[PDB]
C-alpha cells in the first residue's frame, strides 16, 4: 500500500471542517441565500464535512491502535465511521441530484417550483434524503462484503458520470445550440413603437394593418411544418376572421411547398411569402414588428427558435414538441398538437381574439421568459455551477470507484492490485472533494463570497474579543 503520512488525512479533514462549517454558517446567517439550491448546497457541505471528519477521525483511531486489537470495540467504531462516510457519500449524490432537480425546474418551471419548494418542504426533502441515506449507509456497511452493495455504489457513481457527461454535452458542447444570444436578440436594435414597426413592415409588403403572423424556417414535409401552416391558412381562408389576419411566410426548400405558399400569396393578399434566406438582423426586426410567430415544427429539440422571437416581443404559436414545449408556457405563448392544421388554425383564431385586448404584458412575459434562458442569467449560471460540482465529485471519486470496480472484478489481477495499492491517494482525493466544493460555491456565488468576507472580518473581531 502507498504511504501518505496520517497527518495529511487529519490536516485535510481540519481544512475541510473549517471550510464547510463556514459554508453552512454563511447560508444560515444570510437570508439572501435562503433558497432551495443553497439549502441543497448546505446538505452537500454537511456530507462533504462528515466524509472528511470521519476519514480524519478514522486515521486518528488507526494511529492510536498502532501506538497501543481491543476486540470488537475497534470493529464497532470502524463500522460506525464507515457508515457515516457511506451515508454522507449517498447524501452527497442525493444533494447533487437535488441541485440537478432544482436547476432543471428553476430553468423551465421557475414560478411553479418556487411556490412548491418552501423552506418547510425543502427541509422535509433534505431530512428524508439524510434519513434514507443513513438507513441505506448503515445497511451498506452491514453487507459491505456483498457484491450487491458495491455494484449499487458503482451504479450510483456511473449515474453521476452519465449525469456529468449529459450536463457537459448540454452546457458546453451544445452551448450555442440552445443558448439565447442576448447581445444580438435585443429589443434595443428596434426603433419606435411596435405599432409603427408592424405598420411600416406591412406597408413594405403592400398590406393593411392587421394581426400579423410570421413563419421562419425551411420548406419541408415532416420537419419545420410549413405544410401544417399552409393547410391552416387554407382552413382560415373560408373564415371571416382571416381578413383581420396577416401572414408572412419566410424560407426555401421543397418547390412543391414553395409553389403552394406563392399560390396562396397571389390568391389572398394578406398572405406574403419571401422564398429567400433573410439576414438574422432583418428576422430580428420581423420578430419585433409581427404580433405572433408560428413555429409548427414536427421536431424542435431546442426552444431557441421561440426564444429568439420571444426576446423581441413576438408571441409564439408553436407545437408542443421538444424545446418549444419546455420554453413556451400559457403566459408566454400558445401550444398546439404537431401536424394538426385544424388545431393550429384555431390557435391563430385564438391569437386573433387575444390581440383585441392589450398584448403588452403577454410580450413582457415572453421577453422575461426568453431572458431567463441566457448563459449570463442566474438560472443557467447555476446549471454551470452544478456541472462544475458534479464534475469535481466525479473526478474526486473516480479513482476510488475504479478501485471498487477492480475490488469485485479483478482483485487477483496484478494491474488491478497495483492500482488498488494507491487507495490512500484515492481517499486523499475524496478529502479534496470536501475542500474544492467550498471554493466552487464562493467562486460561483457572489452573495456567499460577501457573507464569507463578513466572517473573516468578524473572526478578526472574535480573536480581538478573545484576548481582550
Amino acid at each position: 500500500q502507498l504511504f501518505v503520512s496520517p497527518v495529511v488525512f487529519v490536516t485535510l479533514g481540519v481544512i475541510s471542517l473549517l471550510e464547510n462549517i463556514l459554508v453552512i454558517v454563511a447560508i444560515a446567517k444570510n437570508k439572501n441565500l435562503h433558497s432551495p439550491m443553497y439549502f441543497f448546497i448546505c446538505s452537500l457541505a454537511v456530507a462533504d464535512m462528515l466524509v472528511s471528519v470521519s476519514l480524519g477521525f478514522e486515521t486518528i483511531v488507526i494511529t492510536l491502535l498502532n501506538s497501543t486489537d481491543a476486540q470488537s470495540f475497534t470493529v464497532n467504531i470502524d463500522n460506525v465511521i464507515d457508515s457515516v462516510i457511506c451515508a454522507s457519500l449517498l447524501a452527497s449524490i442525493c444533494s447533487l441530484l437535488s441541485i440537478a432537480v432544482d436547476r432543471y425546474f428553476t430553468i423551465f418551471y421557475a414560478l411553479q417550483y418556487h411556490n412548491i419548494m418552501t423552506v418547510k418542504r425543502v427541509g422535509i426533502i433534505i431530512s428524508c434524503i439524510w434519513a434514507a441515506c443513513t438507513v441505506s449507509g448503515i445497511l451498506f456497511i452491514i453487507y459491505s462484503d456483498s457484491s450487491a452493495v458495491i455494484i449499487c455504489l458503482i451504479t450510483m457513481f456511473f449515474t453521476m458520470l452519465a449525469l456529468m457527461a449529459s450536463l457537459y454535452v448540454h452546457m458546453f458542447l451544445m452551448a450555442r445550440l440552445h443558448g439565447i444570444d442576448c447581445s444580438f436578440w435585443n429589443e434595443s436594435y428596434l426603433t419606435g413603437s411596435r405599432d409603427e414597426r408592424k405598420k411600416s413592415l406591412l406597408s413594405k409588403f403592400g398590406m393593411d394593418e392587421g394581426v400579423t403572423f410570421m413563419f421562419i424556417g425551411r420548406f419541408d414535409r415532416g420537419q419545420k411544418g410549413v405544410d401544417v401552416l399552409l393547410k391552416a391558412i387554407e382552413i382560415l381562408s373560408s373564415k371571416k376572421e382571416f381578413q383581420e389576419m396577416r401572414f408572412i411566410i419566410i424560407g426555401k426548400g421543397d418547390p412543391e411547398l414553395e409553389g403552394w405558399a406563392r399560390s396562396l400569396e397571389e390568391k389572398h393578399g394578406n398572405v406574403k411569402v419571401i422564398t429567400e434566406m433573410l439576414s438574422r438582423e432583418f428576422v430580428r426586426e420581423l420578430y419585433g414588428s409581427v404580433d405572433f410567430v408560428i413555429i409548427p415544427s414536427y421536431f424542435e429539440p431546442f426552444g431557441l427558435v421561440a426564444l429568439e422571437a420571444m426576446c423581441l416581443g413576438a408571441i409564439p404559436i408553436a407545437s408542443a414538441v421538444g424545446g418549444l414545449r419546455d420554453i413556451i408556457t400559457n403566459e408566454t405563448g400558445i401550444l398546439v398538437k404537431a401536424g394538426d392544421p385544424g388545431e393550429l388554425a384555431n390557435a391563430i383564431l385564438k391569437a386573433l381574439e387575444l390581440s383585441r385586448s392589450d398584448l403588452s404584458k403577454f410580450r413582457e412575459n415572453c421577453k422575461k421568459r426568453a431572458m431567463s434562458f441566457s448563459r449570463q442569467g442566474a438560472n443557467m449560471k447555476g446549471a454551470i455551477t452544478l456541472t462544475i460540482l458534479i464534475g469535481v465529485f466525479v473526478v474526486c471519486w473516480a479513482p476510488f470507484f475504479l478501485h471498487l470496480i477492480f475490488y469485485i472484478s479483478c482483485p487477483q489481477n496484478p494491474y488491478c492490485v497495483c492500482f488498488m495499492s494507491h487507495f490512500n491517494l484515492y481517499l486523499i482525493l475524496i478529502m479534496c472533494n470536501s475542500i474544492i466544493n467550498p471554493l466552487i460555491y464562493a467562486l460561483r456565488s457572489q452573495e456567499l463570497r460577501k457573507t464569507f468576507k463578513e466572517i473573516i472580518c468578524c473572526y478578526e473581531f472574535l480573536e480581538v474579543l478573545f484576548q481582550g
Binding site: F9, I62, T74, H403
Partner: peptide, 7 residues
C-alpha cells in the same frame, strides 16, 4: 481495520 472500506 483500515482507512475507508474495500481497500
Amino acid at each position: 481495520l483500515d482507512h475507508x472500506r474495500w481497500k
